Symmetry: D2
Subunit: 105 residues, 4 copies
């Protein structure tokens, strides 16, 4: 099968959506998209067409985002490794300087 | 059974020292203890705990308040059942919290 | 004054939790008793905005797991929060062996 | 792959929160700048006590837990293929809380 993809990043250290986080989508090491979360911490779509079956990586540049805000983190970035092939994947990042998580939304 | 906890402030990546945690069973309090420098409470009862419904409540809102940090969560209450050892950590932050059965 | 919503996802299976009972109370007085829909959601807990105060949102997760033939050490999931924004979205990410919440958006 | 290893030490603990039990037999690798430094397996308590004989130097590291393969061996499907933590360097304890439908990490200890 094939599915569309979205994400949402929340900074749970402050309880606010994370605006301005760069998030990249790659497949077999080739970048497909490099986008930025909006004021609601969201990226509504990574592609016009559903993504074909395959192995994907969604990487949020969380370390750089914390650093621009003058904040330290042990985690340098947040990478989600997933497989496609359900019409939609929503894969949020819940982030903090001291930890992070994801789930199938 | 025996009961322990561990509280980690994931907003800073450090153990949460000085958090008050209360144990109760059917509304009656069994223990009131404070996390140590490692964020831990090794045991809530000198005697082993019988089967029943229990509540562990960490005073997280008050803990963040003491550090001058705002949170919409006022406290963190876990509701669990003893039908072994139960290790029930709290992972806390001003904007969210988690628990799980650890080991 | 603010409105309140929730979303319950069973992360043990990666699916929205349909049919979980969720109640809202304030000072022991119950204000709502609702059930999550097919998307694991409850869009509002009140007809009018909730006044400032301390609230308790309780999802009957243990009962929900039990109806499906599944055991959990957690009997229910209770979120205690305070209304001092426009909206509070307070999800439950649940599993037989653990659960979490966060201030969403 | 072979099991192997050999200033801050590194440990992990993997819990399957879908069942509330330690995850035994999960392969976890440590790498730095492309080079894999260690490849180990969680014990009955879901733990790997150390990824190195001596404490690790400063730098950027990647701990990767083969969670998808572990779930698949138990006949359980997941959209997550593995769990990679990217971090920087006293002790680093970096647990994985895993489930077929989501996972998390944090700095423990």
């Amino acid at each position: 099968h094939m599915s569309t993809l979205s994400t949402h990043i929340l900074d749970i250290s402050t309880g606010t959506p994370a605006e301005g986080v760069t998030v990249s989508l790659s497949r077999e090491g080739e970048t497909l998209a490099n986008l930025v979360t909006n004021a609601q911490g969201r990226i509504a779509t990574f592609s016009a067409a559903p993504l074909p079956a395959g192995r994907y990586c969604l990487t949020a540049e969380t370390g750089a985002w914390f650093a621009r805000a003058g904040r330290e983190s042990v985690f340098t970035r947040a990478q989600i490794d997933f497989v496609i092939g359900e019409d939609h994947f929503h894969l949020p990042f819940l982030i903090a300087p001291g930890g992070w998580s994801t789930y199938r939304g």
